[model samples]
Target chain A: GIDPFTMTNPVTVEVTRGLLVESRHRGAVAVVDGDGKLFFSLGDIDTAVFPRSACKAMQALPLVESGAADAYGFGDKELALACASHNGEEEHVALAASMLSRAGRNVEALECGAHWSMNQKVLIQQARSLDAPTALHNNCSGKHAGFICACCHRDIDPKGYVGYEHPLQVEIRAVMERLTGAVLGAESCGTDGCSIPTYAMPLRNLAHGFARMATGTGLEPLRAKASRRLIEACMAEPFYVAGSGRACTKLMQIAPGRIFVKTGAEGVFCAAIPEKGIGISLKSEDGATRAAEAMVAATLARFFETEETVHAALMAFAAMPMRNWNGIHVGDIRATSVFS
Target chain B: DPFTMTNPVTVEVTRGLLVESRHRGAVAVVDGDGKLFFSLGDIDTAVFPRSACKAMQALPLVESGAADAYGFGDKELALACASHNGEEEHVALAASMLSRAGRNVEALECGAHWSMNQKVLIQQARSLDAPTALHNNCSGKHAGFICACCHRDIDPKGYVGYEHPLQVEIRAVMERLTGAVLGAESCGTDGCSIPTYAMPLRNLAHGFARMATGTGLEPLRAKASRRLIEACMAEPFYVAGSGRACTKLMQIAPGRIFVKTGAEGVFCAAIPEKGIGISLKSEDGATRAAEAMVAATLARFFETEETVHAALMAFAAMPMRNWNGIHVGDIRATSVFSA
Candidate 1:
């Protein structure tokens, strides 16, 4: 058993071999079919859910569709990274650096704050190597770089572009609102890890947004193409979009052309399957990714019957054995919050 | 899996005052397929290979097209077979992979561990922080499996399963090399929640011998063997971290030796030039015993060579030390492992 507050109406990730409750990640879920209808749901779907990094695809939509990317000769890898929450590795840093150089700006002009890499290896190395990185190493640097290019085209000041009032930010909002069908807000909690603007909305609305994005509809010709490109970039080089040991890469790798997925902070998971024109977004109330991932994987479990890969993936997160120090089966955690 | 270490063997490290106590373990060595050159104590009983099977486990990652699909370099490939100490390069490359996929470090399901690099771990010692899965020694292997699952459309979520396609591929790879299907072998859980199988020590040796030669298998198997060994020999640091015995051993002999280690007193080797494979274990889980036994086997493995001593110098005797670094008892292999 788990604490009721967290466990109530929750999905349980347990070490089924015999163990304590691994997590009680309770939250909302919304899944829409190709008919533009909510065909599946769980928990309080109406509860506001912050898209967090999940909205990166929408945030990056204009960078390509607006022709700024085309004008600067940005490559596919660049287009993908533009929507990435990259590990802040050398390649990621190099891309940001190249982007700024092309636009005639320095790292200082980029406003996504300084931080050690989110990559475990880079963090250890930077600490050991004693190298404190600037915004170039920020996970959002590529996104910031996209903004810089957009601002370059918008004929506005690139400096302080992460601000709520910048033209680039304004364009990003229009794009997000277009997808989510809601007036996306700047911040209620605070700025994202990248020190730039991000948005939040109802869990179901977020799913609706993803549904629109996934269907290859709900946008003008230019923005639609840009959205399509974003998804393509994600699928073509899923590795370019996420870090090592992340769900996005693995999910795309296994699901291939069938699924478009991304994870966000505070326990948010979102995906859109084009074949069905459906989107699935779930949140683990405590913002615990461990719980959120299990629940999200469970949400996708219905697809397991079709793909053996999906079966293995869903079983992995939905039900796994928790072990002791001696590798003994100490406990387990599994998903129990699914509703279809 | 059965936890039966029912063999009795003793090693007199030293006999002076306060001598380093004896170590208990077993030994198995083979020079060719289905042939056993030596067996000491109880080699039939199963033992968790721990991290020892890392090289074998990495076989599928390459075979499944995951390696080529990810376009990982030799270092990443090597790290995939590693039990790294969370060093700078180890985590950096792994992190780069996640970045390419648009994932966070949090996506790693491997449990957390303090940095094995003591200096680096201590650097952040003030309420440092909760370690992430990236800090685990097997992070590289886990990453490799994830990549494989991605390529095969096998969900990486069940990457640890004995049934998951990726895990099944890993098992198949192990069977090809070890010559014992894991389904028929005694299975146990690994430190990283992966499945590790057990069989006669001789079989382990036989498998490794084949691994070294990259022969005795179909074309694809041969290609996989070469790739796996190349990565291991190429990126010694990723296989094991700095200042470690495994790393040093490979560094000492270069391409001349292919070495790997496992948890709970297990060690394995593949000598391509010699066309042989070896496996060692300490019944008491004392690493010193395993290393000492390894040296003894190497002495005979290379006794006929003119340059054996220099290469065997590092492992001849694992010396015990006091706090001030004074000479103390030495750990020596007492097992009679003769052909």
Candidate 2:
């Protein structure tokens, strides 16, 4: 069942001082209040976007609720990485590998096919030792590993776990529905880049989902507790959450117990502010990260005017400086957003 | 864009008689006399090899008298050509090389990382709060470049740039070894923040073959390659680490064989005894497939195919299963090696 909405407005990520529009980005945003009410939105809030890796927060629910993390005696780092869109560094890979091992599986059992890590230097270094990327090198591998480990807890067959109708997928869908307060069956279903079943839903509902992960609105007690653990673990291991030099890592480090953030590919971002008991979701309809980051930065600034440190540290990303191959800073991509 | 796409050659692993898995890639093996003994898919197609040419890249660092200037040991020399796992030993030696050039870990631009080995990763996790530049595997290579620059009286602060003198020299050596000029190759920065190059698999193989025998016209270059091989053979762990295919291969075979793996389905090897160079590329860039094909190719070339399989039994074929150490499938070379 296709949705009856699409991105209709385009915003400029203006380049240079003259505001010459160098890149145009389209986006929809939704801010869900503590009670999961739609507090803010831009563009077609009723429409859907894939949400991409931003869904890891929701995906991590099964890991903790199933007690698979504990049954396998996973640590906080493992727990944090379970919700990560990591750089696929060796640390990240080893954790995914060990999680598979603890679940009585090995790298071969990991369904997420291998790709070279985003840790460019390490990938180059790895080239002299390994010819191909391992599943652990996939940025989504931590979430996938956690999913499989949860399957092990239930004594379910782990093969073909990436299938849409697999038990884990079913559980994931249910969680998404409960958390987002949306009927997911009406949404489009397809595979994520890492080869997992992902769905598209109204942007408003997706933000409400983030709120659920934050305040556990309409969530089960266990699911609620898992969300808390997610925030705690993500706060504990920001590096494991993302990686070196990532905005998520630095922002989480700078903010500290204030907000947990995740960036999805093709320009999607979600933030869970547990303290405020709200969730913010934004998507670049044209799929440019700079626009989304700037919008989020502007939104966060308005959201927390009292805490200027976080805003200041993230200011670099607000405009998002553009650098050339020679490492020379040439211009900045500043945003024009629909939000106030 | 010039990469000729061919139907992928798949290496399948079977279990209980059914094909359990398949690894699709290409293979090329050239004899000492530069004859193509085996061909699968488009071996002539060019690819940006991620790290397989590290040895060739490190060649100029030693040949330019930098190794002697720093009084670098055989192990240090080997480490210079390595993609090390940032163990304490690897870190310490790289730091030493940088220190010899009046630099430090802060000077390394390769970026930070942790060891891939599970035990080491957990240990680092438990002990340290975060990774640093020294943790990056390519820091060793960076140190080698630093020392090379220090010997040349150049400011070594940014030696990794493509236009940097150090990078130009590296290009010369790689071009000389592989017979591909930098101008004609697909040049880019490596993961280590250094300029890297790409060329066809065949030329890469020819370069490694030269490493095997070192019959280069320049006596000093031949001597340097001989010394480099000596260092790699003497300290194989410096090449990679324990349990790694490169480390294991060199540890078992010593001077007779040395192999280097590159990112995205690139592999190059030198077999001095056979005077041959081998290069393989997986169409899909799978590591296991390329390795299996390389092993099977070597098994066919050698005296005892059984011994070859036994030695590389771990990677001999993709062991079909490990749900609980069960043989779920089999993946091995299906390509013919026509000598």
Candidate 3:
């Protein structure tokens, strides 16, 4: 789904000469045909070491298609919304609470542990009020609840659904493996702060999974609709997706409906541009969100057909200048891409 | 050259034990009465205590009548302020404290895990697959805060927030006791989601001194506060169980001394009998070295205590031998100080 000829010229333009040298370059960009054949590839792509959060979208798909939402009386919005990596905002908390209450559950029923959200002020206030911390406050609670709902719908045990070897997880793993066209290897188990099983996969597998999310035909209509609605909700209620001014939420706002971006811990970033049939995945060698987002923006701009929209969406990061209190330019970063 | 094994490297160190045996880099020591007996490098530097600060942070609960409001006893109060190792006994005690405070696992803001080593051992023995709230290391700290909230007659929710009355009280206590004004630029978040403070190492040493002497009117808030310190000293095993150096040192010394270890090569000890405070830091942040130094310092001060001397010697005498096939540099444990 990548368009590799957006930047026709590999020109080096210095935004601030001597302050910084700007090189417009390209790297491994691939265009896959409709038949799943590689139309073009520059460097390389491997399907291993894709972290847990990137797999969340595909993990929620099977639950959507199985009529789990209908069984739980959840509308399209709730199902789509649950697949989100929310910012743990107030509205998200309220919705998660309401959903749990509707299912005859309380915060106690949530096994995920407490963690501070990106919004430290809210977390502090919550702690001061002595309010009962809930799983919803855990960003991945929606995903966990979705898994539970799917298990209930299918008449399987919902308890311990987060266990790596649980039936629910087994089914999800099957779906993920099939979607990525790779076998799920022996997963090394580690507990996330939220008490859920987090796994590791190759980056190639991660990219492939994103590609499937962008253009997989095997997705059930209900699942596809659920995925679309989730993306839309994330865009429509970006704040609910993450706190005010969070990286993922802001990227969604910058691109509006055209692009969907999700970030994970340890410098992992993934995006899907449906209009361009492009799924992009990248990782910063250092686990820095700022660098990863900047790199992803640079990569997308290099390959896309329309430079205007890409440039506009990435204006915040493209050749941004850094200055001291005196407004003297200290440093600047320019986005560049390489395509073969 | 036949490479003879002659001229074996040997080094001698003398002075206050706390000063000489600091781990590689940073080191300091305070006496029982909160007096700075010896220090090496910068001892007055300010750093976040991380989990170590929990004990003092829980003081508000006692002052607010929260412990009595929720009917928590000395053991419960102690655990409430402890950064325990999630042992079964510790977990059971924490759960009991929570129950007394009319709360449950859901009320805890700190995350949960499989209990610290002991609980893991139990699970392995019983082949139990379930992980419970007892595994959360901060459970004791949370339970203490809950008790404090109960005493203050405030809702227990959001007690961890910096704006909370309890947190405000803690900041006041830290400032007053340490005799150091918190800097305006101190706004770093701690790993445990609390407001971390920054001060000079001198302030830290003075604070340890005050804690050792039980100075200020606050220590008289309740008999339990004094008793809590006593219990920690008396039953050092209960302070931190099994293979914990802090617990072992406290138990070996009993009421003669009080000690606590902070993460990243920071250690504080007090001899109430001598009215002195001893503080030490290892620059390399090697905990083992810090402990060794603390023990050595105690031995140097009280030469009569053979046990303390032995402990110090054990840590100070380990040999560093080269193992790799490639011949390279070797390091030996040698103290460089003269008193």
Using lDDT, give the best candidate's number.
Answer: 2
lDDT of 3 by residue, A159-263 (tens): 776577888767777777665566664443334445554445545555655665666444656555766655555556666555565767777676667766677
Q: Pick out the ten consecutive residues of candidate 3 chain A with the lowest summed lDDT.
A: A17-26
The sequence of per-residue lDDT tens digits that candidate 1 reaches over residues A293-318 is 77777777776567886778766766
lDDT of 1 by residue, B1-339 (tens): 867443544344542232213445577778756678777777775555768878787777787877777778788878888888877688787776655444546656677676655455645432345556776788888887776666677667756667877766777777777776566336656677777776667778888888887767778777877788778888899888877777877776677777788865688887888788888776545565677677667667676665665466447566654322434346655546433
lDDT of 1 at A107: 84
- The regions of model 2 sitting more than 4 angstroms off are A1-340, B1-7, B13-21, B320-327, B335-339
lDDT of 2 by residue, A1-340 (tens): 9767644544534443112222234556788886867776777677556777887978988998988988998878998899998987878989999999999998888887776655545554455456566777888889989988999889999899887788998999988888887776523664566777667777788888888778866777888888888878898899998898677887787678787888886578898788887788887654455566776765665576666777676665667766433354434666664444
- The RMSD of every model to the true structure, in order and in angstroms, is 20.5, 12.4, 17.1
**Cα error, candidate 2, residue B258 (Å):** 0.3
Better of 2 and 3 by TM-score: 2
- Kindly report which residue stretches of model 3 are placed more than 4 angstroms away from their true locations once superposed: A1-44, A75-77, A124-132, A187-190, A218-226, A303-310, A318-340, B1-339
